[PDB]
């Protein structure tokens, strides 16, 4: 009952393998700190912690396939795979974007349905919806922000919030 980084992948997997609903992936956004010489501030930054992808034109496909192979070094690549992948390089200043707003105000932000995502004025919600997501969720924890996405419209269930609560840290 006080989780650490070594179980984080296991807990993310547990979260959407045990889920009653059809979630496409889970992401954990870990906090880090970015000191700025210019102001002296140590701003909280949410960056990629870990993730678990479950899942379910030809030029674009060529590029994506090309990117996959390059990454292997260092068959279709679906929209949600790509979104999951592209998500790995994103980060968020505390208070900004879906994870940063979630973390700053210790919030559950539950966006269900395409219009909820496009009406949120939130950039990552908009990107998710472009890649076919219909539900996006951010839940602040003690150590960052848990995010869930799905290509289906999923209502907030108490079962899911229960599992979340048993798999991450809270104050």
């Amino acid at each position: 009952p006080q989780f650490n980084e070594d179980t984080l992948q296991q807990r993310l997997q547990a979260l959407i393998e045990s889920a009653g609903e059809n979630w496409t992936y889970a992401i954990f956004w870990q906090i880090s700190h970015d000191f700025d010489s210019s102001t002296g501030d140590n701003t909280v930054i949410l960056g990629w912690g870990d993730g678990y992808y479950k899942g379910e034109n030809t030029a674009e496909q060529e590029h994506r396939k090309r990117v996959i192979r390059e990454l292997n070094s260092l068959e279709e690549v679906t929209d949600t795979e790509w979104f999951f992948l592209v998500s790995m390089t994103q980060s968020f200043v505390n208070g900004v974007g879906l994870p940063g707003e979630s973390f700053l105000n210790s919030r559950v932000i539950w966006l269900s349905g395409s219009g909820a995502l496009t009406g949120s004025g939130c950039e990552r919600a908009g990107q998710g919806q472009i890649y076919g997501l219909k539900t996006m969720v951010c839940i602040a924890t003690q150590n960052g922000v848990v995010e869930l996405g799905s290509s289906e419209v999923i209502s907030q269930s108490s079962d899911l919030m229960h599992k979340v609560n048993n798999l991450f840290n809270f104050n």
């Binding site: 992948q9 870990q30 960056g47 990629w48 912690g49 870990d50 993730g51 992808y53 996959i68 990454l71 292997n72 795979e81 999951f84 992948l85 790995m88 390089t89």
Partner: peptide, 17 residues
């Protein structure tokens, strides 16, 4: 980026299946 590296690794390996 180690956190990204591990996730990337796990993602690609599971992708193979």
């Amino acid at each position: 980026p180690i956190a990204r590296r591990k996730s990337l690794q796990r993602f690609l390996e599971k992708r193979k299946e």
